[PDB]
C-alpha cells in the first residue's frame, strides 16, 4: 500500500540527453538514433528573443555552429532542419543507448514524467500533468530547455513533451517532439495568456478511488448523484465536466472497490461543497488531479 | 521557477537491480561489483515468517538455491552470507553497470529517492523522507522488497535504504545496506509499534523558504520569534524542536531571501496557530516536511 506522485524510471531517457550549444546559448537536446532534437530558440541571443524570425536566424547558422556534446564526447553535425519549434540536428553517429521510442502528442489531463536537465546532464525526475490549459506546473530553471516529458510502456519510451519556456506567471510551456507547442504559446519573449485552467475531474475521482484502495475512506458517504447533477457542481468549482467516456475509464477502479462511479462523484460533490474540514486524503489537504485512472491502476498493480 | 517533489534520476540504480528467488519467494536484489544485496526474508516461506530463526533457515540453503537473474541472464552464486537483515550473495561476475557508490545510514528527517521494483524490474521513482519515527511513507506492493533508497552527489550513488516490510498501519520499514533496520523494527510477521511521528520542522521551514523563492509570499508576516517561544509552539503541534544546528543549515536560504530564520519561524508559528485559511503554498494545502534545506537549494540551483 501507499500512494505517491511516482515518476517512471528515468534511465532510458538519461542515455538520450545531450548538451546543444549555438553561439552563446546552451540547452538540452534529445539524441535518438542519428538525430538530436532541441528547442529552436538555441539559435537566438537574448536580444532577438523579443520577436525572432527563426527562418532568418537559422540561415546564418551552419552545421558546425551547433556544438553537440554527449557526456564528454563531441557529436559531428552533418545536417540541420527546423520542424515547427524544434531543431533536428542530424549527427554522424546513432545513439547506442537509444531505447525503443515513439513520439506522441498527449491529451490535456494526461500525465507524464519529466527529466529536468542542465548542460545535457540530468538533475531530477518528477511526475506532472498536462493542464487543461496546456501548461505544465514543472520545476525548471534557466538552462532546463530541451528537458523532456515521457511515459514508458514496458520497454518503449513515448516522448510527449519538450520544455521550451516559462511564462511570466511561473508556469511552463513546451512542445510535442514534432515542435508543435501545446496550447496557444509561441516561442517569443512576450506576455502570453495561459487561459483558464480547470481541475481534471476524472483524475480527482481516480485519486479518490486510490485513497479507498489504500485505506482512506472517511469521505465515502451514503449519497449518489447523476452526471447532470454532478456537472452542475463541477461547473461551479471550475472542474472539467464528467462524461460517460470518463465513467468508462473509471470502470476498473469502480470494480476494484465496489463503489459505483456516480457514488464516488457524490463523495466528490460533498468534498467540493463542504471542503475537507481539516482532514487529509493520501497525505493531501486538497483534491489531487495529477493521477489518471491508468496511473492509479498501474501504481496499485506494480507494472514494470 | 516551480517546486516539485523531485527524485534523483534513477538510471544508475536501474542498472543494479536484479531478481533474487529462493524456494518459492522472489524479491529484488542490488547488484554492486560482485555482490548481490537483498532482504534476508527471501529464504522464508509465509509459514516461518511468524517467528523466523534466520540462522537455522539459511543453513538449509546452499549457493545454488539463490537464483539471481539480471534482466534475462542468470548470475552464478559462489558465496552467501548474512549481515544483520540482508543477504550478500557473492556472484562470479562484477556488475558492468556498477556506478561509483557508498553505503550510508541517513538520519531521520533526511530525504532520498526510492526506485520501486518488482521481479528485478523498475516500475517507478519517488522522493520521500525518513520519518522521525524511522518509517517511510512509500508506495510498495508485494514483491517490492529489496527496492532501494538513495541519494546522488555528482556521479556517486549513496545507497541508504533497502525496503523490507509493510507495517499493519500501512507504513514502511527497512534497513540500511548493512542490513540494520532503521527504527525498532524486526523482520517478523508481528504487529510492531512505529511510535509517535513528528513533523520535520527544519524541512517545513526550508519549504517555506522555497515558497518565497518561487513567488508564494502570502504567509510572510510582520512578526518574529525566539527559538524558545517557537519551540513551545512546535511542542504543541508535534513538530520537532528547532535547534541552532537547524538555524545554521537554513542560513543559505535565509541569505537568498533576506528573511531571518526566526522571522520565518514566526510565519510558521502563525500558520500552525491559524491554519492556511483555505489558501495554498506551492500547490499544497498543508505544511510540507519532505524537502530538506539541501533539497531546496539543489532544486533552486540546478545541481546535476
Ligand atoms: O523561458 C525561458 C527562455 C525563453 C524565453 C522566451 C521564449 C522562449 Cl521559447 C524561451 N527559459 C526558461 C525555461 N524554464 C524555466 C526558466 C526559464 C528562464 C528562467 C526559469
Ligand atoms: O511486508 C512484507 C512481507 C514481510 C512480512 C513480514 C516481515 C517482513 Cl521483513 C516482510 N511485504 C511487503 C512490503 N511492502 C509492501 C507490501 C508488502 C506486502 C503487501 C504490501
Among A53, A48, A52, A11, smallest CA distance to A157 is for A11
Q: How far apart are CA B4 and CA A137, in angstroms?
A: 9
Q: How far apart are CA A237 and CA A249, in angstroms?
A: 22
Q: How far apart are CA A148 and CA A103, in angstroms?
A: 11
Structure-determination technique: X-ray
- ∠ at Cα B85 (B36, B144), nearest 5°? 65
Q: How far apart are CA A174 and CA A145, in angstroms?
A: 9
Q: How far apart are CA A105 and CA A149, in angstroms?
A: 11
Residue bearing cell 549481515? B83
CA-nearest residue of chain B to A4? Answer: B139
User: Looking at chain B from residue 128 to 147, which residues have their Cβ under 8 Å from any Cβ of chain A?
Assistant: 128, 137-141, 143-144
β-pairing verdict for A111-118 and A100-103 = unpaired
* Burial status of residue B55 (CB atoms within 10 A of its CB: 0-12, 13-18, 19 or more): exposed
SS (H, E, C) chain B: CCCCCCECCCHHHHCCEEEEEECCEEEEEEEECCEEEEEHHHHCCCHHHHCCCHHHHHHCCCHHHEEEEECCEEECEEEEEEECCEEEEEECCCCCCCCEEEECCCCCCCEEEEEEEECCEEEEEEEEECCCCCCECCCCCCCCCCCEEEEEECCEEEEEEEEEEECCCCCEEEECCCCCECCCCCCCCCCCCCCCCCECHHHHHHHHHHHHHCCCCCCCCCCCCCHHHHHHHHHHCCECCCCHHHHHHCHHHHHHHCCCHHHHHHHHHHHHHHCCCCCCECCECCCCCCCCHHHHHHHHHCCC
> Cβ separation of A125 and B283 shorter than 8 Å?
no
> Cβ separation of A6 and B139 shorter than 8 Å?
yes
Q: Which cell is A65 given?
A: 555552429
Q: Which of the ligands is closest to the CA of residue B117?
A: 2
Q: How far apart are CA A83 and CA B79, in angstroms?
A: 56
Among A275, A278, A297, smallest CA distance to A287 is for A275
What domains appear along chain B, each with residue ranges and CATH number? 1-14+100-197 (2.40.10.10), 15-99 (2.40.10.10), 198-301 (1.10.1840.10)
Q: Which cell is B135 given?
A: 518509517
Distance from chain centroid for Cα A168: 19
Q: Which of B38, B39, B141, B164 to mutate to test the pocket of ligand 2 (most atoms within 8 A of CB)?
A: B164
Q: How far is CA B28 from CA A163, A165, B128, in A?
A: 34, 40, 20
Q: How far is B285 from chain A (nearest CA, A)?
A: 5
Q: How far is CA B80 from CA B23, B83, B87, in A?
A: 15, 10, 7
Please answer whether residues B293 and B202 qualify as being in contact, where contact means their C-beta atoms are separated by less than 8 angstroms.
Answer: yes
Half-sphere exposure of B109 (CA within 13 A, CB side): 18
Among A298, A220, A199, A304, smallest CA distance to A252 is for A298
Closest CB from A276, A285, A304 relative to B121: A304
Resolution, Å (one decimal)? 1.5
Q: Which of the ligands is closest to the CA of residue B170?
A: 2
Residue bearing cell 526510492? B114
Q: How far apart are CA B157 and CA A97, in angstroms?
A: 21
* Burial status of residue A274 (CB atoms within 10 A of its CB: 0-12, 13-18, 19 or more): exposed
Amino acid at each position: 500500500s501507499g500512494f505517491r506522485k511516482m515518476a517512471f524510471p528515468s534511465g532510458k531517457v538519461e542515455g538520450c540527453m545531450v548538451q546543444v550549444t549555438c553561439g552563446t546559448t546552451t540547452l538540452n537536446g534529445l539524441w535518438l538514433d542519428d538525430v538530436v532534437y532541441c528547442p529552436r530558440h538555441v539559435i537566438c541571443t537574448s536580444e532577438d528573443m523579443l520577436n525572432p524570425n527563426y527562418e532568418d536566424l537559422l540561415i546564418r547558422k551552419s552545421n558546425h555552429n551547433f556544438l553537440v556534446q554527449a557526456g564528454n564526447v563531441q557529436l559531428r553535425v552533418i545536417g540541420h532542419s527546423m520542424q515547427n519549434c524544434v531543431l533536428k540536428l542530424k549527427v554522424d553517429t546513432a545513439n547506442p543507448k537509444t531505447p525503443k521510442y515513439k513520439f506522441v502528442r498527449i491529451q490535456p489531463g494526461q500525465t507524464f514524467s519529466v527529466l529536468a536537465c542542465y548542460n545535457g546532464s540530468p538533475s531530477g525526475v518528477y511526475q506532472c500533468a498536462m493542464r487543461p490549459n496546456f501548461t505544465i506546473k514543472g520545476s525548471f530553471l534557466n538552462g532546463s530547455c530541451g528537458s523532456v516529458g515521457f511515459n514508458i510502456d514496458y520497454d518503449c519510451v513515448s516522448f510527449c513533451y519538450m520544455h521550451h519556456m516559462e511564462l511570466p506567471t511561473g508556469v511552463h510551456a513546451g512542445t510535442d517532439l514534432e515542435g508543435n507547442f501545446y496550447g496557444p504559446f509561441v516561442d517569443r519573449q512576450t506576455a502570453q495568456a495561459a487561459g483558464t485552467d480547470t481541475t481534471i475531474t476524472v483524475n480527482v475521482l481516480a485519486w479518490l478511488y486510490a485513497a479507498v484502495i489504500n485505506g482512506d475512506r472517511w469521505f465515502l458517504n451514503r449519497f449518489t448523484t447523476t452526471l447532470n447533477d454532478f456537472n452542475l457542481v463541477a461547473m461551479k468549482y471550475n472542474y472539467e465536466p464528467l462524461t460517460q467516456d470518463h465513467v468508462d475509464i473509471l470502470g476498473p477502479l469502480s470494480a476494484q472497490t465496489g463503489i459505483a462511479v456516480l457514488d464516488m462523484c457524490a463523495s466528490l460533490k460533498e468534498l467540493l461543497q463542504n471542503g475537507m474540514n481539516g482532514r487529509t486524503i493520501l497525505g493531501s489537504a486538497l483534491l489531487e488531479d495529477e493521477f489518471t485512472p491508468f496511473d492509479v491502476v498501474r501504481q496499485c498493480s506494480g507494472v514494470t
